[PDB]
């Protein structure tokens, strides 16, 4: 596919989505719990669709109406025998999940998804459910899609330690042991995100945290919440990098959640000569109204040690450096993990087709900056932050395509940038 190109304005009101990750918790949490829970902000995503649709099928009820979810918990025990197959899209996140909610269900059960999904292995999961006493079996011994899954009444708890880092995993066997009779260990081999952690204990059920162990007693009870799921953080950096370099640029941005990656990367921003304003701060929800305009932006240095979830937005954060007059450097603190280093290659690589000055190095990346962009070909290869990067860096492109095949990237988001390019 090819991409809009050379814009000459940009007004409107974009509203972050929410986060998918504390989405799919409360439509889990929410049923696993007992009394009514409300999810206010929900990613309209279609893993969340997927996931609510799961578990109507295990006999929750959940009510989507005028934009709020309302879920009638069915306790902890109280999931029901499906009489149909559990459909999970391409969320391979959901499957993982899932799996360790029904590691205590006492009936058969299916999970399948479509031809992305049934290339994904499962063993990651199997393997310590198995351990619990739950039958969980995929294709091939690498336990690719469909899997035919059957939890016990006897679940035993877990004493795993993960060979690989995975949030998933963690959540799955978090879930699960929240149904054990006993005390479950589980030990992280990285520090992945707390989005669980801190859900499970807003939800009412305990944990112990030391390091990157993880103790959970079960079995627990949880209570229904009110949940209000803050806005999507690598949206929210998206939109204020392209509200900054788009040429005749306003954009008003709602629900920006206040946490360390937005605070970080606001910063960086005033800092480069950025023009943003925060308003409509909500000290209760930790949200704003950010308001960005076009800058004439200048280098700066960007330290990964001042931006916790930088690595994800690397890619829009380097088209913002790219806009800069002069040097940026982003120098991570930390040592980089292969998947790192290779994010900032195809990143540097991508922007470079179009025009980029942009240096890989050890520790990051060395961006020279103010680069009239120009057109090219560059394939996503799955990541969509790449892809949305290249339509923000496309609006920045004077003349020539750019052509932008693998675009799979799916939501509303081009409806939006049109909605933009015609607002005033
Ligand atoms: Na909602
Ligand atoms: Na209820
Ligand atoms: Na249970
Ligand atoms: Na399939
Ligand atoms: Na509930
Ligand atoms: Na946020
Ligand atoms: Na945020
Ligand atoms: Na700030
Ligand atoms: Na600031
Ligand atoms: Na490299
Ligand atoms: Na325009």
Redesign the pocket.
């Known amino acids: 596919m090819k991409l809009k190109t050379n814009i000459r304005h940009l007004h409107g009101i974009i509203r972050?989505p929410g986060d998918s990750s504390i989405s799919v918790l409360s439509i889990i949490f929410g049923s696993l719990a007992e009394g009514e829970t409300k999810v206010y902000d929900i990613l309209r995503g279609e893993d969340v669709l997927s996931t609510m649709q799961v578990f109507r099928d295990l006999g929750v009820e959940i009510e989507d109406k005028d934009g709020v979810i309302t879920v009638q918990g069915v306790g902890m025990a109280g999931l029901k025998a499906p009489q149909n197959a559990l459909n999970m899209g391409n969320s391979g996140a959901s499957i993982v999940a899932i799996s360790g909610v029904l590691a205590g269900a006492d009936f058969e059960v299916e999970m399948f998804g479509d031809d992305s999904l049934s290339k994904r292995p499962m063993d990651r999961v199997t393997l310590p459910l198995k351990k619990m006493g739950v039958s969980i079996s995929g294709q091939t011994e690498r336990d690719l899609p469909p899997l035919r899954l059957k939890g016990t009444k006897n679940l035993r708890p877990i004493h795993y330690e993960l060979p690989i880092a995975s949030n998933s995993v963690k959540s799955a066997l978090m879930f699960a042991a929240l149904q054990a009779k006993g005390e479950s260990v589980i030990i992280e081999k990285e520090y992945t995100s707390n989005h669980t952690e801190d859900m499970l204990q807003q939800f009412g059920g305990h944990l112990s945290v030391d390091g990157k162990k993880i103790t959970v007693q079960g079995p627990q009870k949880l209570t229904g919440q009110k949940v209000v799921v803050?806005?999507?953080?690598s949206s929210?950096?998206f939109w204020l990098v392209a509200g900054l370099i788009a040429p005749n640029s306003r954009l008003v941005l709602q629900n920006?959640?206040?946490?360390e990656?937005?605070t970080g990367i606001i910063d960086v921003i005033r800092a480069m000569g950025g023009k943003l304003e925060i308003t409509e701060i909500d000290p209760v929800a930790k949200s704003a109204t950010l308001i960005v305009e076009s800058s004439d932006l200048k280098g700066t240095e960007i330290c990964g040690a001042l931006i916790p979830r930088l690595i994800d937005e690397l890619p829009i954060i380097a088209l913002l450096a790219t806009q800069a007059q002069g040097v940026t450097v982003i120098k991570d603190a930390e040592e980089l993990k292969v998947k790192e280093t290779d994010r900032i290659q195809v990143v540097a690589d991508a922007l470079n087709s179009m025009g980029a000055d942009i240096t890989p190095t050890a520790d990051g990346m060395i961006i020279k900056g103010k680069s009239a962009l120009h057109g090219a070909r560059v394939n996503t290869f799955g990541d969509h932050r790449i892809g949305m990067m290249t339509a923000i860096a496309a609006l920045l492109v004077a003349d020539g395509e750019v052509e932008l095949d693998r675009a799979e990237a799916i939501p509303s988001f081009f409806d939006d940038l049109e909605s933009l390019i015609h607002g005033l």
């Open positions: 972050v803050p806005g999507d953080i929210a950096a920006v959640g206040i946490e990656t937005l």
